[PDB]
Amino acid sequence: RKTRHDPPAKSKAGRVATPPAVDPTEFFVLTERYRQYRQTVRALRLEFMSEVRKKLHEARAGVQAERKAQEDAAEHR
């Protein structure tokens, strides 16, 4: 690509981006569908964060982990 120190092209120095055609009746329902989809994926993201929290807690200080931490100490002595 391009770097910070290279000048822009002459044909694009005098160019600005043009927005495409807009359909209102499609755009409104499209945006409400975007919001309805994003809230669902946000809830699923929260669910996965919670399950990761449960798994990491059960891996660090779990009921099974404490059993091993005690039986190893007993067998050592």
Binding site: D23, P24, T25, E26, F27, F28, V29, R33, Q36, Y37
Partner: protein
């Protein structure tokens, strides 16, 4: 080749027995090369059209040897009886074209039970066979599934309010387009 249909007839014939006998077709064949160690790659193809390139190959100097999956006696000579592996081209002496054809024919005859090969004892895939799990059994249907409703209420196309359409059209003036109502449910064909 007079047979053209039954390759093993030549192997059972007498002109094979008096010429080769109980020995393989490649027993008397000796390959000529540049030193004491032959090249790892043999001749690619020795029969170009009608011309024969010098000393021909054991199965390939005689046109009555047809490489095929039916004649197991011919294919057995190129497969070791003890180890069960296919002899390579430097081992046998055939040109590489006939070598690939030999490998393909050996595999294709093996896949038909004519040529024997090793069958190891393989344990069953599953340690415990349980069909009661929900992976293979039916699941209780959803209330939206039993009703005929899509999974989520926003899946269907709902008509936007006229006030919101006007609000959009006011802000997006100059970029407006033709409106489109609810789409048809079923797609027609051509």
């Amino acid at each position: 080749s007079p047979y053209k249909d039954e390759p093993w007839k030549y192997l059972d014939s007498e002109e094979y027995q008096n010429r080769y006998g109980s020995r393989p077709v490649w027993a008397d064949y000796r390959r000529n090369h540049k030193g004491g160690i032959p090249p790892q790659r043999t001749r690619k193809m020795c029969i170009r059209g009608n011309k024969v390139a010098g000393n021909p190959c054991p199965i390939c100097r005689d046109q009555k040897l047809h490489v095929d999956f039916r004649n197991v006696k011919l294919l057995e000579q190129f497969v070791c009886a003890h180890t069960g592996i296919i002899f390579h081209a430097p081992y046998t002496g055939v040109c590489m074209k006939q070598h690939k054809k030999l490998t393909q024919a050996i595999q294709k005859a093996r896949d038909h039970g004519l040529l024997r090969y090793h069958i190891p004892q393989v344990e069953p895939r599953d340690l415990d066979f349980s069909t009661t799990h929900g992976a293979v059994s039916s699941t209780p249907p959803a209330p939206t599934l039993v009703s005929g409703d899509p999974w989520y209420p926003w899946y269907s196309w709902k008509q936007p309010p006229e006030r919101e359409l006007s609000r959009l059209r006011r802000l997006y003036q100059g970029r407006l387009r033709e409106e489109s109502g609810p789409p048809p449910e079923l797609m027609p064909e051509v």
